[PDB]
Amino acid sequence: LDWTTFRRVFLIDDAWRPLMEPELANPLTAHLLAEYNRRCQTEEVLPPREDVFSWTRYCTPDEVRVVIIGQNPYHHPGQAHGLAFSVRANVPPPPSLRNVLAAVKNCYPEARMSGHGCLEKWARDGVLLLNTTLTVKRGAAASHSRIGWDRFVGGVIRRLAARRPGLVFMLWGTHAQNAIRPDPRVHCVLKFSNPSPLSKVPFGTCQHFLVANRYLETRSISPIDWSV
Numbered sequence: 139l140d141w142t143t144f145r146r147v148f149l150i151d152d153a154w155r156p157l158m159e160p161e162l163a164n165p166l167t168a169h170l171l172a173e174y175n176r177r178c179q180t181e182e183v184l185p186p187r188e189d190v191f192s193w194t195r196y197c198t199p200d201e202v203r204v205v206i207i208g209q210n211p212y213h214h215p216g217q218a219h220g221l222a223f224s225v226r227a228n229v230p231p232p233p234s235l236r237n238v239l240a241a242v243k244n245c246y247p248e249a250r251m252s253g254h255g256c257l258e259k260w261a262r263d264g265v266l267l268l269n270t271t272l273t274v275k276r277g278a279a280a281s282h283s284r285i286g287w288d289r290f291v292g293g294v295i296r297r298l299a300a301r302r303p304g305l306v307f308m309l310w311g312t313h314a315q316n317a318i319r320p321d322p323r324v325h326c327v328l329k330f331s332n333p334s335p336l337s338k339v340p341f342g343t344c345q346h347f348l349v350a351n352r353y354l355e356t357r358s359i360s361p362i363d364w365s366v
């Protein structure tokens with residue numbers, strides 16, 4: 139796998155090169171990319187190719203302050219755009235995102251919320267919203283969960299963590315908690331139940347947004363304005 143070509147095909151911003159280029163030397167990455175291309179030739183795959191790595195464009199690795207792990211992208215046209223949980227700005231927030239935003243509002247009663255679910259503002263501020271599976275077949279939830287994205291994304295996150303001590307991780311649900319296992323002595327690891335509508339545990343009481351900011355302050359890092 140050649141970086142220049144990989145970067146050009148996915149419109150990846152070059153600041154992420156040191157964290158992603160090494161993944162191209164792993165033989166399994168080639169297998170993953172071949173399967174992804176195969177899928178694209180036989181299925182309507184989402185999000186559009188140009189958005190699969192949008193997360194590399196909103197901020198650089200050194201700007202990342204918080205990492206929020208997702209599972210699979212939304213599988214309906216017009217929803218997913220490369221960031222975990224986020225939807226394009228004309229889409230009413232789907233249930234799990236609605237649940238996340240309710241907790242944000244509970245944490246920050248004075249937050250001026252927009253009503254939309256596009257998290258571009260958080261991403262530009264260094265909130266890395268990364269799904270462990272980056273693509274999906276339209277109309278079939280979690281359909282690409284076994285093609286190999288999770289190992290690739292895991293590699294990137296592991297490299298980011300080693301390069302960047304003091305990150306805050308928000309691991310919501312069993313899947314996120316099993317896939318990502320940061321050293322709790324080097325990073326702030328926050329766990330909660332899934333904001334998924336299937337969870338019978340209210341996500342509205344999640345105080346991670348506030349806990350994260352207190353942690354960043356003890357490390358002399360500016361806090362995140364969670365309004366969106």
Ligand SMILES: O=c1ccn([C@H]2C[C@H](O)[C@@H](CO)O2)c(=O)[nH]1
Nearest residue numbers: 208209210211212222223234334
């Ligand atoms: O980018 C996304 C979109 C959705 N979901 C999740 C939350 C929940 O498990 C289900 C949506 O109800 O998929 C993610 O993890 N990442």
